[PDB]
Amino acid sequence: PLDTTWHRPGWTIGELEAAKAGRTISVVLPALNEEATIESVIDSISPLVDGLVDELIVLDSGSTDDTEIRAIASGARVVSREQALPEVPVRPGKGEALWRSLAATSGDIVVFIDSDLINPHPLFVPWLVGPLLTGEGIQLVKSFYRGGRVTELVARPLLAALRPELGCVLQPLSGEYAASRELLTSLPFAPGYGVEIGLLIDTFDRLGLDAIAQVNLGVRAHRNRPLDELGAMSRQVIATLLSRCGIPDSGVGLTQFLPGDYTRHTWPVSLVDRPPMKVMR
Amino acid sequence: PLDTTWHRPGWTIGELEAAKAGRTISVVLPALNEEATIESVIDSISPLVDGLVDELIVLDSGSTDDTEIRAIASGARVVSREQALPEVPVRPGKGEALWRSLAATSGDIVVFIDSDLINPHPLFVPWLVGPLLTGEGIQLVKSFYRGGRVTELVARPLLAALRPELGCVLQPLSGEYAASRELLTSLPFAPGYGVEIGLLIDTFDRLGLDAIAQVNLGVRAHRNRPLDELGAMSRQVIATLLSRCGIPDSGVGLTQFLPGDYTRHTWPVSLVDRPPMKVMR
């Protein structure tokens, strides 16, 4: 489209390493109870360490399963939310984890990869960093791939309504993306599952489409979740999206009625972003 | 909740008929290519005709299958969009059909039932009209039942964000509902799949929750559709919902990229409501 899109990447690893030119690369895997998938994800990236990748961490976000110990056994440095930034009490949600991870990394470039991926290609990271290394003015790279109910029913239609320029983004909510530290530390971080959409919209509003690229990763598999759980995610995405569009959110959580006779449950929603990590230094 | 909710209805048909007190009841089944389900729906209601129900029509919305002939063979009066209101050229979408149906009916009370239902209970209509007949000040009755991806991910979360008072509505997009002619002819009709949500929000804004009821119909089955198709529906629901909340919609249709290599397709969206049918008389 009007967006820089690689529908098939082809840089070799040696070219990319050469292109670093003193710049460093950190990789962060946020993880909450992903014991089943975490090892395969770590193993897919660790051969790059001390070479193309200078740093790899798992940001453990309060797991109560064997996530941390399995990650350690895969040679990964595991960092709790508390260790990333101990002077600041921990809030729940993904955005907190990603924001904190900036304080636990040092790379000029930062790559995020979700830890719930089922057997990810070992070229995910090179493909994401390609445009940052060989491009001009690129500061953010989003992935896409080949059922994404929230993406196609919520985020993309809302983008069409309120930021149609971002209509060309195939996977705005993708947990796999890369960006410059300079950008990331200059942006606020939305709470919960709002974090990705916020970064995308803020980036666009600030630098326009020319600073954004997207790359095809092929076909990704993962643990599809419960509708009930995607309600809360959609709610936070909506809250975050409306905010960027200058629209006031009620702050009222989604309520759900579960049949058993029905019982009612209300999920939390947050209207508070974390500020740019820059202000913390 | 704060809403009048019958979690199990129990009026007998003779009580309801008595309660009519000179008021009449029309039933409308909108239909676009529903040949597989239309007969069962018609048959479920026709025993009520000349009794509780004074009038039953199928509003054929441009079907190219055997919908019309099968409906006729079930003893139903079939009315095209053109026959309902021939002086006015036809627009596409559900809202046009429902709006036009007001000109093809005469009942003081109007009941809508979707024609894509799989073997609906013959008590749907009595259950919906109950609160209008035996209640006070009720002008609109919505159904609910026991996976509704658009309802739980789009409409209910957006309602929480922008009209949290309607959070108690379990099925805001339900195609099965009943209302007074006086109300319906005083409201505009949103285009496409926006029609239900528009009527609900307009009703609430104008008369408040006390004029709205919802009733449990048990468990409904129907033809679940393609994500791609629910994209356009969500888009129109969003457009219609934002409008009622005073928020400008871009008017840009949802675009989708279909793998084959990808191909791109853009779906139509409409920001034009039909005005109250009253102005047409």
Coordinates of C-alpha atoms in Angstrom, one line a residue:
Chain A
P1 CA 0.0 0.0 0.0
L2 CA 1.1 3.5 1.1
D3 CA 3.0 1.6 3.7
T4 CA 6.4 -0.1 3.3
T5 CA 5.5 -3.7 3.0
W6 CA 7.8 -6.6 2.6
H7 CA 5.6 -9.5 1.5
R8 CA 8.9 -11.7 1.5
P9 CA 12.1 -10.8 3.3
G10 CA 15.5 -12.0 2.0
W11 CA 18.4 -10.4 3.8
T12 CA 21.0 -12.8 5.0
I13 CA 22.1 -12.6 8.7
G14 CA 25.6 -11.5 7.8
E15 CA 24.3 -8.5 5.8
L16 CA 22.1 -7.5 8.8
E17 CA 24.9 -7.9 11.4
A18 CA 27.1 -5.7 9.2
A19 CA 24.3 -3.1 9.0
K20 CA 24.2 -2.8 12.8
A21 CA 27.1 -0.3 12.7
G22 CA 27.6 0.0 16.5
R23 CA 23.8 -0.1 17.2
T24 CA 22.7 -2.8 19.6
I25 CA 19.7 -5.0 19.7
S26 CA 17.6 -6.2 22.7
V27 CA 14.9 -8.8 22.5
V28 CA 12.1 -9.0 25.1
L29 CA 9.7 -11.9 25.6
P30 CA 6.9 -10.9 28.0
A31 CA 5.4 -13.9 29.7
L32 CA 2.5 -14.7 32.0
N33 CA 2.0 -18.4 32.5
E34 CA 3.3 -19.6 29.2
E35 CA 5.2 -22.7 30.3
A36 CA 4.0 -24.8 27.3
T37 CA 5.4 -22.5 24.7
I38 CA 8.2 -20.4 26.3
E39 CA 11.1 -22.8 25.6
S40 CA 10.5 -23.1 21.8
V41 CA 10.4 -19.3 21.6
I42 CA 13.6 -18.8 23.6
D43 CA 15.4 -21.5 21.6
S44 CA 14.4 -19.9 18.3
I45 CA 16.3 -16.7 19.2
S46 CA 19.2 -17.7 21.5
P47 CA 21.6 -18.8 18.6
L48 CA 21.6 -15.1 17.7
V49 CA 22.9 -14.0 21.1
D50 CA 26.5 -12.6 21.2
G51 CA 26.0 -12.1 17.4
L52 CA 23.1 -10.2 15.8
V53 CA 21.3 -10.1 19.1
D54 CA 23.2 -8.5 21.9
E55 CA 20.6 -9.1 24.6
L56 CA 17.6 -11.4 25.3
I57 CA 15.3 -11.3 28.3
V58 CA 12.1 -12.9 29.4
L59 CA 9.9 -10.4 31.3
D60 CA 8.0 -12.6 33.8
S61 CA 4.7 -10.8 34.6
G62 CA 3.6 -12.8 37.7
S63 CA 3.6 -16.4 36.4
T64 CA 2.5 -19.0 38.9
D65 CA 3.4 -22.0 36.7
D66 CA 6.8 -23.3 35.6
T67 CA 7.4 -20.5 33.2
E68 CA 10.4 -19.0 35.0
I69 CA 12.3 -22.2 35.7
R70 CA 11.8 -23.5 32.1
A71 CA 13.0 -20.2 30.7
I72 CA 16.1 -20.3 32.9
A73 CA 16.7 -23.9 31.7
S74 CA 16.7 -22.5 28.2
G75 CA 19.5 -20.1 29.1
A76 CA 17.4 -17.0 29.2
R77 CA 17.8 -14.2 31.6
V78 CA 14.5 -13.9 33.4
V79 CA 13.4 -10.5 34.8
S80 CA 10.4 -9.9 37.0
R81 CA 8.3 -6.7 36.8
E82 CA 9.8 -5.8 40.2
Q83 CA 13.4 -6.3 39.1
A84 CA 13.0 -4.3 36.0
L85 CA 12.1 -1.2 38.0
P86 CA 12.0 -1.8 41.8
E87 CA 11.3 1.7 43.0
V88 CA 7.9 1.7 41.3
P89 CA 5.1 -0.6 42.5
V90 CA 3.8 -3.0 39.9
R91 CA 0.5 -2.6 38.0
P92 CA -1.3 -5.5 36.3
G93 CA -1.3 -5.9 32.5
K94 CA 0.9 -6.3 29.4
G95 CA 1.7 -2.6 29.0
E96 CA 3.3 -2.4 32.4
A97 CA 5.5 -5.3 31.4
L98 CA 6.6 -3.9 28.1
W99 CA 7.2 -0.4 29.6
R100 CA 9.3 -1.9 32.5
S101 CA 11.3 -3.9 30.0
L102 CA 12.8 -0.7 28.6
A103 CA 14.5 -0.2 32.0
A104 CA 15.9 -3.8 31.8
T105 CA 17.3 -3.5 28.3
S106 CA 19.9 -1.3 26.7
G107 CA 19.6 -1.9 23.0
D108 CA 19.4 0.9 20.5
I109 CA 16.8 -1.3 18.9
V110 CA 14.2 -3.3 20.8
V111 CA 12.3 -6.3 19.5
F112 CA 9.2 -7.8 21.2
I113 CA 8.0 -11.4 20.6
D114 CA 5.0 -12.9 22.4
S115 CA 5.8 -16.0 24.4
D116 CA 2.6 -17.8 23.4
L117 CA 3.7 -18.6 19.9
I118 CA 3.7 -22.2 18.8
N119 CA 7.0 -23.1 17.1
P120 CA 8.0 -19.7 15.7
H121 CA 10.4 -19.4 12.8
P122 CA 13.9 -18.5 13.9
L123 CA 13.9 -15.7 11.3
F124 CA 11.2 -13.7 13.0
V125 CA 13.7 -11.3 14.6
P126 CA 15.9 -10.7 11.5
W127 CA 12.8 -10.1 9.4
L128 CA 11.5 -7.5 11.9
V129 CA 14.8 -5.6 12.2
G130 CA 15.5 -5.6 8.4
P131 CA 13.8 -2.2 7.6
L132 CA 15.3 -0.5 10.7
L133 CA 18.8 -1.6 9.5
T134 CA 18.6 -1.1 5.8
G135 CA 15.8 1.4 5.5
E136 CA 15.6 5.2 5.9
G137 CA 13.6 6.8 8.7
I138 CA 11.9 3.6 9.8
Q139 CA 11.4 3.5 13.5
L140 CA 8.7 0.9 13.9
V141 CA 8.1 -2.5 12.2
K142 CA 4.9 -4.5 12.7
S143 CA 4.4 -8.1 11.7
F144 CA 1.6 -9.7 9.8
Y145 CA 0.6 -13.3 9.0
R146 CA -2.2 -15.7 8.2
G147 CA -8.9 -16.4 13.3
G148 CA -8.1 -13.0 14.8
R149 CA -11.6 -12.1 15.9
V150 CA -10.6 -9.0 17.8
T151 CA -8.3 -7.7 15.0
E152 CA -10.8 -8.0 12.2
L153 CA -14.0 -7.1 14.1
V154 CA -12.7 -4.4 16.5
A155 CA -9.3 -2.8 15.7
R156 CA -9.4 -2.6 11.9
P157 CA -13.0 -1.4 11.7
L158 CA -12.4 1.2 14.4
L159 CA -9.3 2.3 12.6
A160 CA -11.3 2.8 9.4
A161 CA -13.8 4.9 11.4
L162 CA -11.3 7.0 13.2
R163 CA -7.8 6.7 11.6
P164 CA -8.5 5.4 8.1
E165 CA -4.9 6.1 7.2
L166 CA -4.0 3.1 9.3
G167 CA -6.4 0.9 7.3
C168 CA -3.4 -0.5 5.5
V169 CA -2.1 -2.2 8.6
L170 CA -2.9 -5.9 8.4
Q171 CA -2.1 -6.8 12.0
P172 CA -2.3 -3.7 14.3
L173 CA -2.5 -5.7 17.5
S174 CA 0.4 -8.0 16.7
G175 CA 2.6 -8.8 19.7
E176 CA 5.6 -9.2 17.4
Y177 CA 7.2 -6.0 16.4
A178 CA 10.4 -4.0 16.7
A179 CA 11.3 -0.3 17.3
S180 CA 14.1 2.1 18.2
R181 CA 14.7 2.8 21.9
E182 CA 14.5 6.5 21.1
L183 CA 10.9 6.1 19.9
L184 CA 9.8 3.7 22.6
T185 CA 11.2 5.8 25.5
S186 CA 9.5 8.9 24.0
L187 CA 6.0 7.3 23.9
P188 CA 3.5 6.6 26.7
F189 CA 2.5 3.0 27.2
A190 CA -1.2 2.1 27.3
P191 CA -2.3 -0.4 30.0
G192 CA -3.2 -4.0 29.4
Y193 CA -3.9 -5.2 25.9
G194 CA -4.1 -1.6 24.7
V195 CA -0.3 -1.3 24.5
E196 CA 0.2 -2.3 20.9
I197 CA -2.6 -0.2 19.4
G198 CA -1.5 2.8 21.4
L199 CA 2.1 2.6 20.2
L200 CA 1.0 2.2 16.6
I201 CA -1.4 5.2 16.7
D202 CA 1.0 7.4 18.7
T203 CA 3.8 6.6 16.2
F204 CA 1.7 7.4 13.2
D205 CA 0.4 10.6 14.8
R206 CA 3.9 11.7 15.6
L207 CA 6.0 10.5 12.6
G208 CA 3.4 9.4 10.0
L209 CA 3.2 6.3 7.9
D210 CA 6.7 6.7 6.4
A211 CA 8.3 5.7 9.7
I212 CA 6.2 2.5 9.9
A213 CA 6.7 -0.7 8.1
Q214 CA 5.1 -4.2 8.2
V215 CA 6.5 -7.6 7.3
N216 CA 4.9 -11.0 6.4
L217 CA 6.0 -13.7 8.8
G218 CA 4.0 -16.5 7.1
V219 CA 1.6 -18.2 9.4
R220 CA 1.5 -18.1 13.1
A221 CA -0.3 -20.4 15.5
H222 CA -1.2 -20.0 19.1
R223 CA -3.6 -20.7 22.0
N224 CA -6.9 -19.3 21.0
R225 CA -8.8 -18.0 24.0
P226 CA -12.3 -17.7 25.4
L227 CA -14.7 -15.1 24.1
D228 CA -15.3 -13.9 27.6
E229 CA -11.6 -13.1 27.8
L230 CA -11.6 -11.2 24.5
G231 CA -14.3 -9.0 25.8
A232 CA -12.0 -7.4 28.3
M233 CA -9.2 -7.1 25.7
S234 CA -11.5 -5.5 23.2
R235 CA -12.7 -3.1 25.9
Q236 CA -9.2 -2.0 26.7
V237 CA -8.4 -1.6 23.0
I238 CA -11.4 0.5 22.6
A239 CA -10.6 2.6 25.6
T240 CA -7.1 3.2 24.4
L241 CA -8.1 3.9 20.8
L242 CA -10.8 6.3 21.8
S243 CA -8.3 8.2 23.9
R244 CA -6.0 8.7 21.0
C245 CA -9.0 10.0 19.0
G246 CA -9.8 12.5 21.6
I247 CA -12.9 10.6 22.8
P248 CA -13.8 10.2 26.5
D249 CA -14.3 6.7 27.7
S250 CA -16.8 6.0 30.5
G251 CA -14.1 4.0 32.4
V252 CA -16.9 1.4 33.0
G253 CA -15.7 -2.2 32.8
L254 CA -17.4 -4.7 30.6
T255 CA -19.9 -6.8 32.4
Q256 CA -20.7 -10.4 31.4
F257 CA -23.6 -12.7 32.4
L258 CA -22.6 -16.3 32.7
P259 CA -25.3 -19.0 32.5
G260 CA -25.4 -21.7 35.2
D261 CA -29.8 -18.9 35.7
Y262 CA -27.1 -16.3 35.1
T263 CA -24.3 -14.9 37.2
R264 CA -22.7 -11.5 36.6
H265 CA -19.0 -10.5 36.5
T266 CA -17.3 -7.2 35.8
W267 CA -13.8 -6.9 34.3
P268 CA -11.4 -4.1 35.1
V269 CA -10.6 -1.4 32.5
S270 CA -7.9 1.3 32.8
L271 CA -7.8 4.8 31.4
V272 CA -4.2 5.4 32.7
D273 CA -1.2 5.2 30.4
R274 CA 2.4 4.9 31.8
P275 CA 4.4 8.0 30.8
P276 CA 7.5 7.9 28.5
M277 CA 10.3 5.9 30.1
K278 CA 12.5 9.0 29.5
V279 CA 10.9 10.8 32.4
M280 CA 12.2 8.1 34.7
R281 CA 15.8 9.0 33.9
Chain B
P1 CA -30.9 -5.4 36.6
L2 CA -32.3 -1.9 36.3
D3 CA -34.1 -3.2 33.3
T4 CA -37.3 -5.1 33.3
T5 CA -36.2 -8.6 32.7
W6 CA -38.3 -11.7 32.4
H7 CA -36.0 -14.6 32.8
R8 CA -39.1 -16.9 32.2
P9 CA -42.4 -15.8 30.7
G10 CA -45.7 -17.4 31.6
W11 CA -48.7 -15.6 30.2
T12 CA -51.2 -17.8 28.5
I13 CA -52.3 -16.9 24.9
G14 CA -55.9 -16.2 26.1
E15 CA -54.7 -13.7 28.7
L16 CA -52.6 -11.9 26.1
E17 CA -55.4 -11.8 23.5
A18 CA -57.7 -10.3 26.1
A19 CA -55.1 -7.7 26.9
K20 CA -55.0 -6.4 23.3
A21 CA -58.1 -4.2 24.0
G22 CA -58.6 -3.1 20.4
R23 CA -54.8 -2.8 19.7
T24 CA -53.6 -4.7 16.7
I25 CA -50.4 -6.7 16.1
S26 CA -48.3 -7.0 12.9
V27 CA -45.4 -9.4 12.5
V28 CA -42.6 -8.8 9.9
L29 CA -40.1 -11.3 8.8
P30 CA -37.3 -9.7 6.8
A31 CA -35.7 -12.1 4.4
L32 CA -32.8 -12.1 2.0
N33 CA -32.1 -15.5 0.5
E34 CA -33.3 -17.6 3.5
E35 CA -35.0 -20.4 1.6
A36 CA -33.6 -23.0 4.1
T37 CA -35.2 -21.6 7.2
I38 CA -38.1 -19.3 6.1
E39 CA -40.8 -22.0 6.2
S40 CA -40.2 -23.2 9.7
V41 CA -40.3 -19.6 10.9
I42 CA -43.5 -18.8 9.1
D43 CA -45.2 -22.0 10.3
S44 CA -44.3 -21.1 13.9
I45 CA -46.4 -18.0 13.8
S46 CA -49.2 -18.5 11.3
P47 CA -51.5 -20.4 13.8
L48 CA -51.7 -17.1 15.6
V49 CA -53.1 -15.3 12.6
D50 CA -56.7 -14.1 12.8
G51 CA -56.3 -14.4 16.6
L52 CA -53.5 -12.9 18.6
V53 CA -51.7 -11.8 15.5
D54 CA -53.7 -9.7 13.1
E55 CA -51.1 -9.5 10.3
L56 CA -48.0 -11.4 9.2
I57 CA -45.7 -10.4 6.3
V58 CA -42.4 -11.5 4.8
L59 CA -40.4 -8.5 3.6
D60 CA -38.4 -9.9 0.7
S61 CA -35.2 -7.9 0.4
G62 CA -34.1 -8.9 -3.1
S63 CA -33.8 -12.7 -2.7
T64 CA -32.6 -14.6 -5.8
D65 CA -33.3 -18.1 -4.4
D66 CA -36.6 -19.8 -3.7
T67 CA -37.3 -17.7 -0.6
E68 CA -40.4 -16.0 -2.0
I69 CA -42.1 -19.1 -3.5
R70 CA -41.5 -21.2 -0.4
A71 CA -42.9 -18.3 1.8
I72 CA -46.0 -18.1 -0.4
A73 CA -46.5 -21.9 -0.1
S74 CA -46.5 -21.4 3.7
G75 CA -49.5 -19.1 3.3
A76 CA -47.5 -15.9 4.0
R77 CA -48.1 -12.6 2.3
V78 CA -44.8 -11.7 0.7
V79 CA -43.9 -8.0 0.2
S80 CA -41.0 -6.7 -1.8
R81 CA -39.1 -3.5 -0.8
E82 CA -40.6 -1.9 -3.9
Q83 CA -44.2 -2.9 -3.0
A84 CA -43.9 -1.6 0.6
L85 CA -43.2 1.9 -0.7
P86 CA -43.1 2.2 -4.5
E87 CA -42.7 5.9 -4.8
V88 CA -39.2 5.7 -3.2
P89 CA -36.3 4.0 -4.9
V90 CA -34.8 1.0 -3.0
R91 CA -31.6 1.2 -1.0
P92 CA -29.6 -1.9 0.1
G93 CA -29.5 -3.2 3.6
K94 CA -31.6 -4.5 6.5
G95 CA -32.6 -1.1 7.8
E96 CA -34.3 -0.1 4.6
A97 CA -36.3 -3.3 4.7
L98 CA -37.5 -2.8 8.3
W99 CA -38.3 0.9 7.7
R100 CA -40.3 0.1 4.5
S101 CA -42.2 -2.7 6.4
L102 CA -43.8 0.0 8.5
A103 CA -45.7 1.2 5.4
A104 CA -46.8 -2.4 4.6
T105 CA -48.2 -3.0 8.1
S106 CA -50.9 -1.4 10.2
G107 CA -50.6 -2.9 13.7
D108 CA -50.5 -0.7 16.8
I109 CA -47.7 -3.1 17.8
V110 CA -45.0 -4.4 15.5
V111 CA -43.0 -7.6 16.0
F112 CA -39.8 -8.4 14.1
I113 CA -38.4 -11.9 13.8
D114 CA -35.3 -12.8 11.7
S115 CA -35.9 -15.4 9.0
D116 CA -32.6 -17.2 9.5
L117 CA -33.6 -18.8 12.8
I118 CA -33.4 -22.6 13.0
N119 CA -36.7 -24.1 14.3
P120 CA -37.9 -21.2 16.5
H121 CA -40.3 -21.7 19.4
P122 CA -43.8 -20.8 18.5
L123 CA -44.0 -18.7 21.7
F124 CA -41.3 -16.2 20.6
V125 CA -44.0 -13.6 19.6
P126 CA -46.2 -14.0 22.7
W127 CA -43.1 -13.7 25.0
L128 CA -42.1 -10.5 23.2
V129 CA -45.5 -8.8 23.3
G130 CA -46.1 -9.7 27.0
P131 CA -44.6 -6.6 28.5
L132 CA -46.3 -4.3 26.0
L133 CA -49.7 -5.7 26.8
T134 CA -49.5 -6.2 30.6
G135 CA -46.8 -3.6 31.4
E136 CA -46.9 0.1 32.0
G137 CA -45.0 2.5 29.7
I138 CA -43.1 -0.3 27.9
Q139 CA -42.6 0.6 24.2
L140 CA -39.8 -1.7 23.2
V141 CA -39.0 -5.4 24.0
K142 CA -35.7 -7.0 23.1
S143 CA -35.0 -10.7 23.3
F144 CA -32.0 -12.6 24.7
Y145 CA -30.8 -16.2 24.6
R146 CA -27.8 -18.5 24.8
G147 CA -21.2 -17.5 19.8
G148 CA -22.2 -13.9 19.1
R149 CA -18.7 -12.6 18.3
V150 CA -20.0 -9.2 17.2
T151 CA -22.3 -8.8 20.2
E152 CA -19.8 -9.6 22.9
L153 CA -16.6 -8.0 21.3
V154 CA -18.1 -5.0 19.6
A155 CA -21.6 -3.8 20.7
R156 CA -21.5 -4.5 24.4
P157 CA -17.9 -3.2 25.0
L158 CA -18.7 -0.1 23.0
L159 CA -21.9 0.4 25.0
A160 CA -19.9 0.2 28.2
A161 CA -17.5 2.9 26.8
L162 CA -20.2 5.3 25.5
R163 CA -23.6 4.4 27.0
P164 CA -22.8 2.3 30.1
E165 CA -26.5 2.5 31.1
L166 CA -27.2 0.0 28.4
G167 CA -24.6 -2.4 29.8
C168 CA -27.5 -4.4 31.2
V169 CA -28.8 -5.3 27.7
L170 CA -27.7 -8.9 27.0
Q171 CA -28.5 -8.9 23.3
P172 CA -28.5 -5.4 21.9
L173 CA -28.2 -6.6 18.3
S174 CA -31.0 -9.2 18.5
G175 CA -33.1 -9.3 15.3
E176 CA -36.1 -10.5 17.4
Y177 CA -37.9 -7.7 19.1
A178 CA -41.2 -5.9 19.4
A179 CA -42.3 -2.2 19.6
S180 CA -45.2 0.2 19.3
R181 CA -45.9 1.7 15.9
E182 CA -46.0 5.1 17.5
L183 CA -42.4 4.7 18.6
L184 CA -41.1 3.1 15.5
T185 CA -42.6 5.7 13.2
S186 CA -41.1 8.4 15.3
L187 CA -37.6 7.0 15.0
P188 CA -35.1 7.2 12.2
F189 CA -33.8 3.9 10.8
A190 CA -30.0 3.3 10.6
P191 CA -28.8 1.6 7.4
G192 CA -27.7 -2.0 7.0
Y193 CA -26.9 -4.0 10.2
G194 CA -26.9 -0.7 12.2
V195 CA -30.7 -0.8 12.4
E196 CA -31.1 -2.7 15.7
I197 CA -28.5 -0.8 17.7
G198 CA -29.8 2.5 16.5
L199 CA -33.3 1.8 17.6
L200 CA -32.2 0.7 21.0
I201 CA -30.0 3.7 21.6
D202 CA -32.5 6.2 20.2
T203 CA -35.3 4.6 22.4
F204 CA -33.1 4.8 25.5
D205 CA -32.0 8.4 24.8
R206 CA -35.7 9.5 24.2
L207 CA -37.6 7.4 26.8
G208 CA -35.0 5.9 29.2
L209 CA -34.6 2.4 30.4
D210 CA -38.1 2.2 31.9
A211 CA -39.6 2.0 28.5
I212 CA -37.4 -0.9 27.5
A213 CA -37.7 -4.6 28.5
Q214 CA -35.8 -7.8 27.6
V215 CA -37.0 -11.4 27.7
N216 CA -35.2 -14.8 27.7
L217 CA -36.1 -16.9 24.7
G218 CA -34.0 -19.9 25.7
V219 CA -31.5 -20.9 23.1
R220 CA -31.4 -19.9 19.5
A221 CA -29.6 -21.4 16.6
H222 CA -28.7 -20.1 13.2
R223 CA -26.3 -19.9 10.3
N224 CA -23.0 -18.6 11.7
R225 CA -21.3 -16.5 9.0
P226 CA -17.8 -15.7 7.8
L227 CA -15.5 -13.4 9.7
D228 CA -15.0 -11.3 6.5
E229 CA -18.7 -10.7 6.5
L230 CA -18.9 -9.7 10.1
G231 CA -16.3 -7.1 9.5
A232 CA -18.7 -5.1 7.4
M233 CA -21.5 -5.6 10.0
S234 CA -19.3 -4.4 12.8
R235 CA -18.2 -1.4 10.7
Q236 CA -21.8 -0.4 10.2
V237 CA -22.7 -1.0 13.9
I238 CA -19.7 1.2 14.9
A239 CA -20.7 3.9 12.4
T240 CA -24.2 3.9 13.7
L241 CA -23.2 3.8 17.4
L242 CA -20.6 6.6 17.1
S243 CA -23.3 8.8 15.4
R244 CA -25.6 8.5 18.4
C245 CA -22.7 9.4 20.6
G246 CA -22.0 12.5 18.7
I247 CA -18.8 11.1 17.1
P248 CA -17.9 11.7 13.4
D249 CA -17.3 8.6 11.4
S250 CA -14.8 8.8 8.5
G251 CA -17.3 7.1 6.2
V252 CA -14.4 4.9 5.0
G253 CA -15.4 1.3 4.3
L254 CA -13.5 -1.6 5.9
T255 CA -10.9 -3.0 3.6
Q256 CA -9.8 -6.7 3.7
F257 CA -6.9 -8.5 2.3
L258 CA -7.6 -12.0 1.1
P259 CA -4.8 -14.5 0.6
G260 CA -4.6 -16.5 -2.6
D261 CA -0.3 -13.4 -2.5
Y262 CA -3.1 -11.1 -1.2
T263 CA -6.1 -9.4 -2.9
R264 CA -7.9 -6.4 -1.5
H265 CA -11.6 -5.7 -1.2
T266 CA -13.5 -2.7 0.2
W267 CA -16.9 -3.1 1.7
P268 CA -19.5 -0.2 1.6
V269 CA -20.5 1.7 4.7
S270 CA -23.3 4.2 5.1
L271 CA -23.7 7.3 7.3
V272 CA -27.3 8.0 6.2
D273 CA -30.3 7.0 8.3
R274 CA -33.8 6.9 6.9
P275 CA -36.0 9.5 8.6
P276 CA -39.1 8.6 10.8
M277 CA -41.8 7.0 8.7
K278 CA -44.2 9.6 10.0
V279 CA -42.7 12.2 7.7
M280 CA -43.8 10.0 4.8
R281 CA -47.5 10.5 5.7

